[PDB]
Amino acid sequence: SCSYVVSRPVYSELAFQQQYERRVLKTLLPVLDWLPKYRIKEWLLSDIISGVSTGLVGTLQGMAYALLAAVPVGYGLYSAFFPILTYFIFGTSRHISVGPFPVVSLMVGSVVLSMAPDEHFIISIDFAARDAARVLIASTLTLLVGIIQLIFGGLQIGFIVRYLADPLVGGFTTAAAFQVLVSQLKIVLNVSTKNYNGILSIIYTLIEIFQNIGNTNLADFIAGLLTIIICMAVKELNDRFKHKIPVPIPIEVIVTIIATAISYAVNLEKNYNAGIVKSIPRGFLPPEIPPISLFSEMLTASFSIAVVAYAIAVSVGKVYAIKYDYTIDGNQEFIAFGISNIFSGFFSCFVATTALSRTAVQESTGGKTQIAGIISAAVVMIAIVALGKLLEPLQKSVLAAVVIANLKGMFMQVCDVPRLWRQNKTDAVIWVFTCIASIILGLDLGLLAGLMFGFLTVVVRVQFPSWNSLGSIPNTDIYRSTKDYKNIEEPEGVKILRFSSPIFYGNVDGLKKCIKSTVGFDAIRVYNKRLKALPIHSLVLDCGAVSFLDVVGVRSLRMIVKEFQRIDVHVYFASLQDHVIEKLEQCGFFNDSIRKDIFFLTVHDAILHLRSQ
Amino acid sequence: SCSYVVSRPVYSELAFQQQYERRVLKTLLPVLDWLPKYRIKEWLLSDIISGVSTGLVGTLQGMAYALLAAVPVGYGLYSAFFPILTYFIFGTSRHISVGPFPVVSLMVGSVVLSMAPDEHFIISIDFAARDAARVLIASTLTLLVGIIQLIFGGLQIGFIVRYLADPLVGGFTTAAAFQVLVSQLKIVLNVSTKNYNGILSIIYTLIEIFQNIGNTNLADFIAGLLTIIICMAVKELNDRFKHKIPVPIPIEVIVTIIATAISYAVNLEKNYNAGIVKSIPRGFLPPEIPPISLFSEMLTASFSIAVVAYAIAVSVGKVYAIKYDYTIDGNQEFIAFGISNIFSGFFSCFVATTALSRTAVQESTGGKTQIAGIISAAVVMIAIVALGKLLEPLQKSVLAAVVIANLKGMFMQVCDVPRLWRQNKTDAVIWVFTCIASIILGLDLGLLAGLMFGFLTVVVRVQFPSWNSLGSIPNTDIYRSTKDYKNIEEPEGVKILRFSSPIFYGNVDGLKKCIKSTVGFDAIRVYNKRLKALPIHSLVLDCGAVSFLDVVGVRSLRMIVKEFQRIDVHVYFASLQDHVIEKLEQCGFFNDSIRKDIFFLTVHDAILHLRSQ
Ligand SMILES: CCCCCCCCCCC(CCCCCCCCCC)(CO[C@@H]1O[C@H](CO)[C@@H](O[C@H]2O[C@H](CO)[C@@H](O)[C@H](O)[C@H]2O)[C@H](O)[C@H]1O)CO[C@@H]1O[C@H](CO)[C@@H](O[C@H]2O[C@H](CO)[C@@H](O)[C@H](O)[C@H]2O)[C@H](O)[C@H]1O
Ligand SMILES: CCCCCCCCCCC(CCCCCCCCCC)(CO[C@@H]1O[C@H](CO)[C@@H](O[C@H]2O[C@H](CO)[C@@H](O)[C@H](O)[C@H]2O)[C@H](O)[C@H]1O)CO[C@@H]1O[C@H](CO)[C@@H](O[C@H]2O[C@H](CO)[C@@H](O)[C@H](O)[C@H]2O)[C@H](O)[C@H]1O
Ligand SMILES: CC(C)CCC[C@@H](C)[C@H]1CC[C@H]2[C@@H]3CC=C4C[C@@H](O)CC[C@]4(C)[C@H]3CC[C@]12C
Ligand SMILES: CC(C)CCC[C@@H](C)[C@H]1CC[C@H]2[C@@H]3CC=C4C[C@@H](O)CC[C@]4(C)[C@H]3CC[C@]12C
Ligand SMILES: CC(C)CCC[C@@H](C)[C@H]1CC[C@H]2[C@@H]3CC=C4C[C@@H](O)CC[C@]4(C)[C@H]3CC[C@]12C
Ligand SMILES: CC(C)CCC[C@@H](C)[C@H]1CC[C@H]2[C@@H]3CC=C4C[C@@H](O)CC[C@]4(C)[C@H]3CC[C@]12C
Ligand SMILES: CC(C)CCC[C@@H](C)[C@H]1CC[C@H]2[C@@H]3CC=C4C[C@@H](O)CC[C@]4(C)[C@H]3CC[C@]12C
Ligand SMILES: CC(C)CCC[C@@H](C)[C@H]1CC[C@H]2[C@@H]3CC=C4C[C@@H](O)CC[C@]4(C)[C@H]3CC[C@]12C
Ligand SMILES: CC(C)CCC[C@@H](C)[C@H]1CC[C@H]2[C@@H]3CC=C4C[C@@H](O)CC[C@]4(C)[C@H]3CC[C@]12C
Ligand SMILES: CC(C)CCC[C@@H](C)[C@H]1CC[C@H]2[C@@H]3CC=C4C[C@@H](O)CC[C@]4(C)[C@H]3CC[C@]12C
Ligand SMILES: [I-]
Ligand SMILES: [I-]
Ligand SMILES: [I-]
Ligand SMILES: [I-]
């Protein structure tokens, strides 16, 4: 059919260049962006129902996630109230529900516990002073996270969540699910376990839990087990029986209400000594300035918490924006969430982000603009000021059981590891390394280690590329690996090397080794042997995949050219890009008899030029 | 002249594949490697003179570098004696002199001081107990460094010194020169400065030195100043007046001998209260087992010290092996230096490597096999057992002044910085970052920060590549950037994108943005708009520079292909390598109507195929 017919001069870089010559209302996102653009006629009612539903869900979610953080139940209500109010202004996303997201809450609680242990703080037991210190530490960490997020918004470096690769995100998610399960399993059993801060901490906690399982509160354990079973069964029924009832079943809220009513009717606090919350303040606490002197002990934790929370927020926002066909500004997501975390930290709250389950609840029940968020915040507020007393008899085991039941989706990511291994071993290695690191480390330290391991994998992949010795398909200009096709004909007296990577320090050492192996000799050795006494005449370097080039790369290429020219062997570079040749010429490569006449467009001009001599 | 004439079928990947089918005496390096091959007839005498000269230099260097480490003078003699003996066996290199190399000594001393401060150890002043503790800490660190080096030799991962890029090596060298200068300036002034451990430590030390400059010992300062001046003057004369006297002038040894004799004659210890060494033990101390319990506090320091010492050793070994036309095994350099550091740590020595000045002295005075090293070790031994008393009146200011005088070569790299900036800004950024980090951090922490910053620079360079929209030179098959050559003709209804980087998570986000900008529209947006209602017909991706590919890359490519096919826009991949296509097919790319018929050999088969329709 169609044919590849081309007739043109043999163009080196010099000849080709001679013939073809080269050469104010967003950083503070207004509510006025959509409030005048609102649809009160029909959007308002949908926003009302969506906000009521997601507020009912988020009040419970904040109460439960206040257990992940080492703060008393009641400050989760503030963490579910204030950030939504202060995100309604600066938020690009219009479908996400702002709240604790128990992974971020667990990291905050780890930081708070490490900075306020039971034995280190209390020598009496002073529960009130300990709780005050824990709340202050959580507020300080939230303020630092907000400061970091706002700074990253000013720097406009919103691509950092790119560095959170999907394999390491999955591994970190599985490890965080394990950590959350261990903490909430400590909570449901109502066992007293001394806090372990450091390496292997989750294993120490599990060991102590298995040792103290004899002190398990029976009523709390049964309540947690039944809550887990009921929530899981109803979730499975909803997933299976999904054709009807498009709205998800709010099983967690119903179970919590039933548990609270039963505990109030039976008085589990004193008859069975169940671990009820026992303390939910009524009213709004006045703002306080967090002690910034602790910022030095929270930097590595605040950075990772900010990164993780922002990544979750933008992930959910993008998932719903592609569905609803709009865009979200990542830098403005920085700005909004940093302002939110600063505002919440001034008001005794832990770090805030979005939760996938709460966002799904908000969207599925008539998801519209952030007015639904305002309605949810109002519901949380009326829970704070009116329903605080009604939730006193609720056991903490029920909340921890709800969290554990929701942990199943995060736990099921271990099934992707064999698939990753079969597809790309590097990604499976990243997954496993991130999971293991986040297990035996802090979650913040695990995330940092995963990021560094991803960088290491990228560097290693660009450092040990696929290099080949090429030859031409007969009667064509297609140069393929000689040992791969069995019909490749080797040219007479010339070796062609394809080094499929940008050449840098690691790659300059690798490329020297590859050239020495391909040509079959070392230029230094043969030159020295010839000097002491006193098969290849040309080497073509297929540099099509050489992306960038550093000073070490230019120096190595210059040394290779000189060393091979010393033994009357010519080195020709082919398929180099314009920018790489510009980097070569600005690094002083074209000095001492180089003159750019040894640079050809592809690896067929070089071979044709050689055949002309 | 020569012409580029090719007549061949238009080959897609499918058609091309259908028509062209694919498919025990070294780990313990013996002295018997060269001892039977020795040249006693004429090599022995040259070895004798070379060993005598380099031993005279190395005794002084060991005593001087024992001040960089926080150990008494006399243990530097052991550090210059034992490692040479135990490297004569396992060493591949035959020209290097094994010893302290004051940068490694300074890192060891920083570790030792941070673990045995004056105030933390002594509450009386117990100089003897403090010195014993410092020696034990130095021996423990040396043993840990040797263990790490031996493990790295077992793993055969000798390419890690590749990761020590020349810019970061230069920045670390300049910062280490500054640190050594500050410490030896504290020593020469004989000022009592409390040790600062942590961040900004060198600036605190400089501040305290400038505050205590009123307590400077005048005699020690004058001795150090004249030692520095004489060393600089003689070195400059030797560099200039270099045609005669090929052997370098051992000015440091002569200066030390003269200073020792003058101090003995005048008794500066009592008359002028000069800071003489005052204590050099006579004889060999028995070996002791270091306390391994300190290994937990030395891991980050020992890793960096081992890496730096091995890098210096292999750098010097390669510099002299290329000159003398032989090869050195990097893994065996691990093995030899790990055994050396273990042996020396058992015998109260700090970490050992090679020094460029001492190696130059050994080589220039008749450099031959490591028998010269044995002679140097014998000279150090006879200095230990006989000349220990003769060096008692020598001031420490003379030794510190010798080190400061030798620091000039390390200091001269701020001159290399500006041309690095003018050539490759990334390498200059790496240089400056490594220098500043190693200044305000530990030297070990600075090295780790520089290595990880180099990894970050590689990741960023492969993450933000040079991408272009290509068009064809008329009547040829050369596709160049349309906005760069001004004679490029845009083809009808097709856009060609060259993304000059391997496609991974950072690059998948970048590539989505680049495709959307190049084609001028978003596939999701136009598809959604067309669904709501109810200029380019093909996109060619020049993937010549796509080196590797991950699961995220394959997912992004499938997503792009499907999104563009949904709007009747065909996506063709060109110039993909065989291994990248293998990765695509093993990652499930060729499912759901892909069939590999949209993959062409170069970006001219795709265009010719399009013109056929
Ligand atoms: C954007 C890019 C990323 C940015 C990342 C930023 C990280 C910042 C780390 C900051 C840092 C190192 C600085 C140098 C780091 C060099 C790294 C080189 C890396 C080379 C590749 C500061 O180090 C010093 O720490 C002192 C406290 O020790 C602190 O306080 C002193 O002065 C105060 C008055 O100022 C005074 O009030 C106070 O009394 C003094 O003590 C000092 O101010 C501070 O300088 C280490 O501190 C961090 O915080 C904790 C400290 O304990 C520690 O927490 C862990 O605890 C758990 C166990 O308990 C553990 O299990 C958890 O994991 C974790 O909760 C962190 O782990 C650590 O990291
Ligand atoms: C191949 C690639 C590189 C590998 C690098 C390997 C680094 C290993 C670091 C090990 C490490 C963290 C472990 C987790 C790290 C996670 C990193 C995640 C990074 C993610 C990107 C261990 O952490 C704990 O430290 C305890 C001591 O604090 C130690 O001792 C405890 O138990 C003992 C009984 O076991 C008991 O006897 C003892 O009493 C207990 O206290 C514990 O055993 C140990 O687990 C930190 O320790 C290292 O050593 C020092 C400690 O102080 C510290 O020294 C600094 O001091 C200067 C100021 O004074 C500072 O200015 C200098 O800089 C530096 O001299 C280092 O900085 C630190 O690093
Ligand atoms: C929807 C429901 C499951 C929410 C949780 C309700 C809680 C408060 C209820 C449900 C079932 C109850 C348990 C049922 C049976 C027993 C056995 C009895 O000898 C002690 C009380 C104990 C252990 C009860 C404790 C309280 C309990 C766990
Ligand atoms: C709290 C403690 C017990 C958590 C321990 C989690 C560890 C042991 C788990 C978490 C994820 C797991 C990995 C997930 C998937 C695979 C692939 C399959 O071939 C089994 C091994 C392997 C590689 C698993 C090994 C064990 C693993 C790393
Ligand atoms: C403590 C735990 C996490 C230890 C490790 C157990 C987990 C990770 C292991 C054990 C059982 C494994 C599963 C067994 C069988 C299959 C079928 C295969 O077609 C896909 C992977 C999948 C689904 C495996 C995924 C990894 C797996 C879930
Ligand atoms: C990809 C790269 C950057 C990951 C680097 C991870 C390193 C720094 C981490 C991972 C696991 C860590 C180890 C985990 C456990 C212990 C035991 C403890 O008693 C001393 C510290 C020590 C020995 C840690 C040292 C640091 C360590 C080796
Ligand atoms: C050639 C080199 C090696 C000689 C070094 C010997 C040293 C110890 C000698 C040489 C010159 C000497 C100085 C000469 C002059 C004075 C001034 C006097 O009021 C106090 C002693 C003092 C400050 C001497 C101290 C010791 C000194 C510094
Ligand atoms: C102990 C203290 C004084 C050490 C201080 C070291 C710092 C301040 C020095 C060391 C090397 C220096 C750099 C060396 C070279 C250049 C290039 C020129 O354009 C001046 C700026 C710049 C980039 C310098 C900036 C300052 C610098 C980074
Ligand atoms: C900018 C270009 C033209 C400079 C050309 C000469 C270069 C090699 C020289 C001239 C003056 C030098 C600077 C002079 C003073 C200092 C301060 C100190 O911290 C050392 C580095 C630094 C910053 C030097 C770096 C190197 C330097 C900039
Ligand atoms: C490329 C990567 C590895 C570089 C990482 C560098 C980071 C971890 C280092 C570089 C300089 C460091 C800072 C230097 C000085 C101080 C002041 C001290 O009171 C608290 C810690 C703090 C604030 C350090 C935190 C960690 C830090 C920001
Ligand atoms: I969730
Ligand atoms: I949940
Ligand atoms: I030296
Ligand atoms: I020296």
Numbering used by the authors:
A (entry chain D), B (entry chain C): 17 to 39, 64 to 164, 176 to 585, 654 to 732
The authors write:
Pendrin (SLC26A4) is an anion exchanger that mediates bicarbonate (HCO3−) exchange for chloride (Cl−) and is crucial for maintaining pH and salt homeostasis in the kidney, lung, and cochlea. Pendrin also exports iodide (I−) in the thyroid gland.
The structures of ssPendrin in the presence of I−, HCO3− or Cl− were determined by cryo-electron microscopy (cryo-EM) to an overall resolution of 2.8 Å, 2.7 Å, and 2.5 Å, respectively. The densities at the S1 and S2 sites are at ~5σ level in both the Cl−- and HCO3−-bound ssPendrin structures, and the densities are at ~13 σ in the I−-bound structure. The overall position and coordination of the two anions are almost identical in all three structures, with subtle adjustments of coordinating atoms. To functionally corroborate our structural observation of two anion binding sites, we performed 125I− saturation binding by using the scintillation proximity assay (SPA). In contrast, both tested ssPendrin mutants with either impaired S1 or S2 anion binding site exhibited a molar binding stoichiometry of ~1. Whereas the EC50 for both mutants were comparable to that of the WT, the Hill coefficients for both mutant variants were reduced to ~1, indicative of the loss of allosteric binding between the two identified anion sites. In all three ssPendrin structures, the anion binding sites are solvent accessible from the intracellular side through a large cavity formed between the transport and scaffold domains.
